[PDB]
Design a protein around this nucleic acid. Structure first.
Ligand SMILES: Nc1nc2c(ncn2[C@@H]2O[C@H](COP(=O)(O)CP(=O)(O)OP(=O)(O)O)[C@@H](O)[C@H]2O)c(=O)[nH]1
Lengths: 620, 710, 400
RNA sequence: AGAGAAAUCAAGGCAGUU
RNA sequence: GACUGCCUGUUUUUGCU
């Protein structure tokens, strides 16, 4: 596209000086700028005085070296108005300014002495004086030779337009792109609908008042089992002589007898050999052990191939759309006993968090409230269960190489203040190659029980454990736990924050009303317990809030998330009516239908729904 | 739920914190997104007519309908053209400063918008590799494609990029001529960069040429095509939704439109989508000086927001604003391209609907075998399906809020409205309850006029104002902080100990400032985060780090090293290193080692860094932790090997080499953008002779340095 | 010189190994500075635990101070990490190994890197707190400058000030004019030991931190200062409150026939939206003596036209903005008083700032309204600077 | 088996021999 | 078939605004 009368070097140099594609007649402007650059480079063609070239060109040079040369000359030129070329022989600057009229002798600027040509060669009189005759002849030649190019390509209007004014932005959509754009719309690129602007008057429906709070449905079916990974409230520990983890696992492996009381079909009783081998290996000193014949059944090794082969063998011949059904199970009766056992009082503090520094009395107040909260919710079964969950999750996630093909043992061992070891159970990591966020790592968790149920633990195989005349119950389950869930249960201690937030709000509000912090307040809080309005003391309330939050966290399925999201609205409406305020709804507004869809099989959502529907539904 | 509703002391609204199952397993998506994609595509067509008739609706290009066609009872996709025109005119008549700032942005800010802003995004669909790639890589490949096919140089401005995209489609056939690695299974090692008793080896890479050809129709399809993905870790819904990403050939246009919407919405008082625009709702709520009048509060949400929204409505609104402002024709020819392209959108179908035969399942395309989506078979283009009505994904949230706000501006509606995409809240201030009901129904009908379609079961009106919600921020005579909303952000990040601690402290401080945390909650959060920090970085119990420090007499001096806590509640803003220096925990001997610039382990970064809580709105934090030896970076993932497209490694290493030669000769691109016109080679050359000539050396030495340059 | 030779060698290597990438435009650096295939920012919280425990879990540039094996532990790997030009992998203990058996640096370098952080720590441990007072406080969020600054700078002048601090030679006259001379020397003095090509990347961030005035939204119960804004997390809350402890010119109207008249002007954005902004104007004859640091002088006032100005200034001392203020009080130049800048304004603050920036970018109005002549005895030049060699000097100006 | 919920994981690719 | 060796555990079509 380069004109033959323009040098290739100056063309490639001017290619990117200014954006020529988004300018009105950008090609003509580029040609004009190439004209000016060829005029200035054509000037000072081997011309020199002293020991340096007579003229220095500033157009289209790096601005850093331009400033350097100007600093050598002890003169400063701005960017928005910089001369074309500077003459050091006469110590004056110049700018090539092509003008068609040639009668515009008026200087464009006073900083630099301007020079002009008439587009066919003739220069202004001072321009003729300040330049040598050979330079004038060369400019004549270039202007005439560009004039034939202008005439041949009939651009005589665009050239004068560009040398007259400045650049104008444009953005043009071609004819081919326009049709493709307009393929799928009735309107054109610039929508011009031929309709009179007005707002129609549309008739709607009346707004109804929600006189009574919605009643959540209660599904009917078999009781829901314990689907959590660990055991929860029905989890106990074995006291061991003080020492390291291996020094306790060896003690357990030596002084114990294992017999099967219960054998579930989900977890065969033959997987106990894997557990015994894992304990033996961990006792010897190597936590990681090789595979055994029972490990295939224990961790489902090569189960995908077997299931695929069986499915290929068993065929029907319809190829229908897959319809996945989710079984509906009612509220199990063990939720209440779990909530009442998780609130029981232990003897030791099970929340050991390192104290923060205290430099300002604001922190001393802050750490006092945290210490009191830990005192309230530490000596409690739920705190011990949170602890055991955290060790079970972290000692597996951390030693989850995430790329391994051998069985790994991760004991769940804690320590009491007296130093005695506490063997809650063992987690057996299996061959895992999880990459996606939905991949499941095979697990075989053995856990110490307190009481078997067979309607709460249907997939758990219960074994009888005898250690120094003491009879415990050992439960083995086969689970597959994803990396995301292991990650989120490694930070299970975060659940303490919400009841801590509630307790902090209560205490700080009491301090605000009394204008003084007490930190020993035990407020009486009224609640709808067993239907009637009874009261608690914020100590067992916060404790059972902690237990409920822990149960919600370990049972956090999409059903629970949707139920809570659609239940916050109903709770807000309950608050609104409790303040003698009336609630109105649009026409087809049934806010309980978005909640009833999330009550399917989760036990905690059923417990929450039963708690909701036991409350008064109308506030007179 | 009976334990979450106190009847004394604190209010139930303060217990909305307990209504979150966070700190538990976030729901994750399994299998194929194709069913969700087809559902989200068939929903706009089902909602067009009052009586569901998909087949007739599939022949509608512009979702303009008569006023009597709007289903006042249920979702209704489409808009009324005259209503859109009049509502846009009413919106323009008010908020004149916003329109003037829009004009300023158009004629002072738009001309110098650089296309390099496209590289600050995230994963985009690549029309060359047919996969999702990082935004810089896609931008580089598409710029190379345009330069090769148009045979010119792309200007630094985004306008030049858009003009190049507009001009490349004028061509008939296009080619790319990329690079591939012939055999990614033949890793070969060479001994380079070191031979002195410590040999260093770097992998070598072989290269070939793609030489792939695109026709006009194929390139247009790739521009139309928007790749679809599952929305993993979506907290708050029982049913998993689907996100999508457009190509790189429409993203510049989209950015122009979204920036225009940003400088419109940041100046109107009815918008909450500004980041600083969610704090005006506190001012509206505190504006409770009603003179004993019926003042309600309607907090709600919109159903099928991305489905019942026709791009032509917001296109018309944009062209109305631009025509009443006085902008030239090309301005309205630039703001209308994105909406006309997404009018012809080609949603990428998944890997196929799940068809089962007994127990085994097969993944079959939409066309093969009958399913529920038999009406959309006529819209299948390869593995992608077209859908004219609906947005299908939220690339336009700002202009969608703009449409919802121009809907607000009537004469009957005399209340206060706040709009943030889906969630919204209205503050009626009327004289009688009948007037309030009429205004609420007028609001509903007007949002249905342009297709906003509030969900009936999600909007609740309280006749005495004071109780409501907006973006998980509950209001009871004031807005109560919700600690639950940010709990997933208290887990330490995964970059390096210093940045992780800085982000943890900054998150806790931000939660305290916003009111979501207080003294005890913040202190407990810090104590939990400290233990999570120490465990995650091998500083608890017996580990490899503790062992290496034990049999080397390396005492722990940092929190990540297992030392005692140094950060108190009053000092989340302070940095660990300076705080330990002032308190006398770090001596000068250790400081001159960990802060030594000659560290081989430290990785340079930026104070501002990407922060996303969990698949939520991206956020920007401040990383003021000093670059000590503990500010490192993790090892690069190596899944890229055994893949044909591993040649991107060679290109990125060459680009790192070029970035290393820059930043050493140009001590200005660290402060501002690059603006020198020309190639990298020429600029580096000229700067080299400038730096050698500006130095203080002998003339012959300068000449020999020049001679050694080639 | 050694560094120049190394730069030449690196340039030659860049030309040789990467010829295609070096043929790209310079403006593409804004895009390929980030060209990486890494996805280390896509939910990194879920990968931290097993990624720092993985063999070779760190990235380290090759170096000689790190032995291959130290006391039986393999510290570093001999294979460069994929996609990384000059970095390899190492063991996670290398950061701990360097903390004791590592090289040292200058004490001044440590202070330079730890400047802003140590300033914040001293500010924290330099004030006396009050007594925590509990009450039902009402906190309202207000935009407040969070981090205290060494000197107040405009948000637009920060890049130019930083360019002056680090690369005063690679800058334009316009950028120098837009700088904030007065805070550049403080930054230079406190930053000199770290202004090296090795540490220029980390120096710019810490220099911006001392100079940036980011306006965060923070709760307050009393009007905070810049000092008591970075500490708002523990001084105010919903329950407790601890009680902690023309531009730059002088006018001196002196002799004046009439006082400064105020002609209120109404700019109509619309028949229904209008903005009223009055401007000060001198009526008749006045004699006003100004002063700005080391430059002083007085000018005559003939209606709204500058009759004559004379100044005493050091030689080659910039004088653009002082005479711009002079034109501001008196309304001697337009646009900026009577007609808009092409766009209708909002407030007087925005209007005066726009008047400053537009006329500092281009001072053509002052020259066209003020007077130009062809001689040499005139003191200043069209660029508004004192005695210098120049042409077409500004007329109607004498010495004092 | 199990995890699980509207469909997936229960290792997957590549080179050589076969 | 399977059967030897190599590789990958975010980069496999999957965290957009
Ligand atoms: N670009 C994005 N927009 C999002 C994202 N998440 C939500 N949104 C926005 O939120 C809206 C999507 O909500 P839906 O269309 O599902 C409407 P609702 O919330 O009422 O859900 P349903 O009742 O189930 O239809 C829409 O405005 C989106 O742009 C996201 O990850 N990216």
């Amino acid at each position: 596209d380069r004109p033959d009368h323009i040098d290739s070097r100056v063309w490639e140099l001017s290619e990117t000086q200014e954006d020529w594609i988004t300018q009105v007649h950008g090609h003509v402007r580029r040609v004009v700028e190439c004209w000016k650059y060829t005029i200035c480079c054509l000037i000072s063609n081997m011309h020199t005085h002293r020991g340096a070239p007579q003229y220095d060109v500033f157009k289209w040079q790096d601005r850093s070296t331009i400033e350097w040369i100007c600093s050598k000359k002890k003169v400063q030129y701005p960017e928005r108005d910089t001369p074309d070329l500077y003459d050091n022989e006469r110590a004056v600057a110049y700018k090539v300014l092509l003008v068609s009229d040639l009668s515009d002798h008026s200087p464009t600027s006073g900083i630099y002495h301007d020079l002009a040509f008439n587009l066919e060669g003739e220069a202004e009189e001072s321009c003729a004086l300040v330049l040598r005759g050979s330079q004038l002849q060369d400019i004549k030649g270039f202007l005439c030779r560009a004039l034939e190019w202008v005439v041949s390509n009939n651009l005589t209007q665009e050239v004068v337009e560009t040398i007259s004014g400045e650049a104008k932005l444009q953005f043009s959509v071609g004819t081919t792109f326009r049709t493709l754009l307009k393929r799928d719309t009735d309107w054109d690129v610039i929508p011009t609908p031929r309709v009179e602007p007005n707002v129609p008057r549309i008739e709607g429906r009346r707004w109804t008042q929600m006189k009574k709070l919605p009643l959540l449905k209660e599904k009917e079916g078999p009781p829901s089992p314990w689907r959590a990974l660990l055991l929860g409230a029905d989890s106990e520990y074995i006291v061991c002589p003080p020492g390291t983890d291996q020094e306790a696992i060896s003690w357990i492996h030596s002084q114990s007898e294992i017999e099967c009381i219960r054998e579930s079909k989900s977890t065969p009783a033959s997987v106990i050999t894997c557990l015994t081998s894992s304990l033996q290996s961990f006792a010897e000193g190597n936590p990681v052990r090789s595979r055994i014949h029972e490990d295939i059944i224990a961790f489902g090794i090569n189960k995908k191939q077997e299931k695929k082969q069986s499915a290929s063998s068993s065929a029907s011949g319809e190829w229908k759309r897959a319809e996945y059904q989710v079984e509906e199970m009612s509220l199990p009766p063990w939720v209440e006993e779990e909530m009442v056992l998780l609130r029981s009082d232990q003897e030791d503090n099970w929340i050991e968090l390192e104290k923060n520094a205290i430099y300002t009395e604001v922190d001393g107040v802050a750490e006092g409230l945290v210490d009191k909260y830990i005192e309230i919710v530490g000596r409690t079964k739920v705190a011990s269960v949170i602890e055991k969950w955290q060790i079970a999750a972290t000692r597996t996630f951390s030693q989850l190489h995430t790329d391994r093909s051998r069985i790994t043992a991760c004991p769940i061992i804690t320590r009491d203040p007296s130093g005695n070891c506490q063997f809650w159970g063992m987690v057996l990591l299996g061959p895992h190659h999880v990459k996606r966020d939905t991949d499941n790592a095979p697990l075989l968790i053995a856990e110490i029980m307190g009481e078997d149920t067979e309607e709460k633990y249907p997939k758990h195989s219960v074994f009888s454990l005898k250690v120094e005349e003491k009879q415990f119950l050992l439960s083995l389950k086969i689970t597959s736990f994803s990396r995301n869930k292991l990650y989120t249960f490694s930070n299970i201690r975060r659940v303490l924050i919400q009841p801590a937030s509630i307790y902090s709000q209560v205490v700080l509000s009491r301090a605000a009303e009394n204008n003084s912090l007490n930190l020993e307040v035990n407020p009486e809080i009224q609640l709808y317990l067993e239907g009637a309005q009874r009261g608690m003391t914020l100590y067992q309330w916060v404790r059972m809030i902690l237990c409920l939050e822990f149960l919600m966290a370990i049972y956090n399925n999409p059903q629970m998330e949707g139920f809570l999201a659609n239940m916050r609205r109903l709770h807000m409406s309950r608050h609104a009516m409790m303040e003698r305020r009336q609630v109105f709804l649009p026409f087809g507004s049934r806010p309980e239908d978005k909640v009833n869809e999330c009550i399917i099989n989760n036990p905690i959502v059923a417990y929450l729904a039963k708690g909701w529907n036991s409350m008064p539904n109308v506030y007179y | 739920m009976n334990l979450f509703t106190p009847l004394s002391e604190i209010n139930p609204t303060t217990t909305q914190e307990l209504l979150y199952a966070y700190t538990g397993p976030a729901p994750v998506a399994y299998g194929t997104r194709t069913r969700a994609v087809l559902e989200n595509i068939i929903r706009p067509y089902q909602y067009f007519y009052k009586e569901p008739n998909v087949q007739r609706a599939l022949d509608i290009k512009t979702g303009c309908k008569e006023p009597e066609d709007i289903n006042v009872e249920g979702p209704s996709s489409g808009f009324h053209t005259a209503s859109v025109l009049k509502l846009a005119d009413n919106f323009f008549r008010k908020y004149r400063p916003a329109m003037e700032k829009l004009k300023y942005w158009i004629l002072v800010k738009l001309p110098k918008l650089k296309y390099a802003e496209l590289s600050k995004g995230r994963q985009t669909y690549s029309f060359i590799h047919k996969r999702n790639l990082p935004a810089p890589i896609a931008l580089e490949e598409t710029v190379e494609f345009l330069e090769q096919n148009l045979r010119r140089k792309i200007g630094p401005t985004l306008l030049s990029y858009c003009q190049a995209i507009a001009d490349v489609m004028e061509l008939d056939e296009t080619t790319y001529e990329g690079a591939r690695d012939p055999r990614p299974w033949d890793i070969q090692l060479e001994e380079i960069d070191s031979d002195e008793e410590d040999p260093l080896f770097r992998q070598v890479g072989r290269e070939e040429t793609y030489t792939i050809k695109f026709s006009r129709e194929e390139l247009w399809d790739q521009m139309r095509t928007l790749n679809t993905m599952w929305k993993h870790l979506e907290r708050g819904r029982l049913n998993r939704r689907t996100i999508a990403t457009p190509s790189m050939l429409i993203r510049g246009f989209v950015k122009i439109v979204e920036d225009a919407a940003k400088e419109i919405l940041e100046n109107v008082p009815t918008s909450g989508v500004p980041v600083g625009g969610e704090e005006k709702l506190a001012k509206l709520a505190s504006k409770q000086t009603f003179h004993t009048a019926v003042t309600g509060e309607l907090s709600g949400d919109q159903e099928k927001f991305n489905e019942c929204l026709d791009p032509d409505a917001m296109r018309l609104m944009w062209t109305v604003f631009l025509r009443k402002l006085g902008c030239p024709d090309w301005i309205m020819e630039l703001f209308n391209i994105p909406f006309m392209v997404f009018k012809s959108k080609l949603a990428d179908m998944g890997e196929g609907l799940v068809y089962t035969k007994g127990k085994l399942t097969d993944r079959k395309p939409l066309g093969e075998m009958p399913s529920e989506f038999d009406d959309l078979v006529r819209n299948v283009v390869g593995n992608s399906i077209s859908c004219r009505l609906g947005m299908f994904m939220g690339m336009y949230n700002l202009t969608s809020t703009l449409l919802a706000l121009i809907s607000i501006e009537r004469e009957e509606l005399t209340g206060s409205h706040v709009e943030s995409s889906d969630d919204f809240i209205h503050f009626f201030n009327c004289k009688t309850h009948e007037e309030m009901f009429k205004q609420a129904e007028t609001l509903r009908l007007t949002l249905k006029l342009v297709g906003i379609n509030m969900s009936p079961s999600k909007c609740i009106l309280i006749s005495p104002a004071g109780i409501g919600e907006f973006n998980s921020k509950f209001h009871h005579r004031d807005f109560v902080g919700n600690v639950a909303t940010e709990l997933p952000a208290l887990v330490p990040n995964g970059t390096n100990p210093m940045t992780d601690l800085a982000m943890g402290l900054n998150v806790i401080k931000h939660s305290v400032n916003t009111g979501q945390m207080n003294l005890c909650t913040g202190a407990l959060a810090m104590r939990i985060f400290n233990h999570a920090y120490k465990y995650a970085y091998m500083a608890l119990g017996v580990t490899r780090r503790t062992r290496f420090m034990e049999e080397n007499a390396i005492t722990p001096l940092l929190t990540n090293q297992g030392a005692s806590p140094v950060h108190s509640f009053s000092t989340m803003h302070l940095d660990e290193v300076a705080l330990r220096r002032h308190l006398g925990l770090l001596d000068e001997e250790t400081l001159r080692r960990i802060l030594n610039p000659n560290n081989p382990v430290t990785q340079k970064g930026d104070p501002s860094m990407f922060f996303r809580i969990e698949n939520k709105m991206p956020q920007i934090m401040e990383d003021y932790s000093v670059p000590s030896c503990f500010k490192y970076t993790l090892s690069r993932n190596r899944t890229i090997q055994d893949k044909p497209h591993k040649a991107l490694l060679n290109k990125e290493e060459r680009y790192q080499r070029v970035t290393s030669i820059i930043n050493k000769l140009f001590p200005e691109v660290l402060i501002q953008e690059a603006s020198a016109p020309g190639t990298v080679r020429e600029s580096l050359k000229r700067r080299l002779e400038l730096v050698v000539e500006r130095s203080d050396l002998d003339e012959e030495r300068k000449k020999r340095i020049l001679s050694r340059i080639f | 010189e050694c560094t120049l030779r190394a730069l030449v060698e690196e340039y030659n290597g860049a030309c040789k190994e990467a010829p295609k990438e070096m043929s790209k435009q310079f403006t593409d650096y804004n895009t390929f500075k980030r060209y990486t295939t890494s996805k280390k920012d896509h939910a990194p919280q879920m990968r931290l635990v097993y990624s720092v425990r993985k063999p070779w879990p760190i990235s380290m540039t090759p170096s000689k101070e790190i032995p291959l094996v130290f006391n039986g532990t393999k510290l570093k790997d001999t294979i460069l990490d994929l996609g990384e030009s000059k970095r390899t992998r190492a063991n996670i203990v290398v950061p701990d190994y360097w903390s004791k058996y590592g090289s040292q640096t200058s004490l001044e370098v440590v202070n330079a890197i730890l400047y802003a952080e140590d300033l914040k720590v001293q500010r924290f441990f330099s004030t006396e707190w009050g007594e925590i007072r509990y009450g039902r406080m009402l906190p309202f969020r207000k935009p407040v400058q969070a981090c205290p600054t060494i000197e107040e700078v405009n948000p637009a002048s920060i890049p130019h000030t930083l360019l002056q601090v680090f690369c005063p030679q690679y800058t334009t006259l316009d950028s120098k004019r837009k700088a904030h001379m007065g805070a550049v020397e403080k930054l230079k003095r406190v930053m000199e030991p770290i202004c090296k090509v090795q540490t220029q990347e980390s120096a710019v961030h810490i220099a911006r931190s001392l100079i940036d005035s980011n306006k965060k939204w923070l709760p307050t119960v009393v009007d905070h200062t810049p000092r008591t804004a970075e500490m708002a997390h523990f001084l105010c809350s919903k329950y407790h409150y601890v009680h902690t402890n023309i531009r730059s010119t002088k006018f001196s109207i002196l002799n004046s026939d009439h006082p400064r008249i105020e002609v209120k002007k109404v700019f109509s954005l619309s028949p229904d939206v209008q903005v009223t902004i009055p401007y000060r104007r001198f009526k008749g004859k006045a004699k006003v003596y100004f002063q700005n640091d080391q430059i002083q002088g007085y000018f005559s006032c003939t209606d709204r036209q500058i009759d004559e100005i004379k100044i005493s200034a050091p030689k080659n001392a910039p004088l653009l903005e002082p005479l711009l203020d002079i034109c501001y009080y008196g309304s001697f130049i337009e646009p900026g008083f009577e007609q808009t800048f092409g766009f209708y304004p909002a407030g007087k603050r925005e209007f005066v700032d726009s008047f400053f920036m537009h006329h500092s970018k281009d001072h053509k109005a002052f020259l066209i309204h003020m007077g130009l002549d062809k001689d040499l005895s005139l003191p200043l030049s069209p660029e508004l600077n004192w005695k210098e060699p120049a042409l077409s000097k500004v007329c109607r100006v004498t010495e004092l």
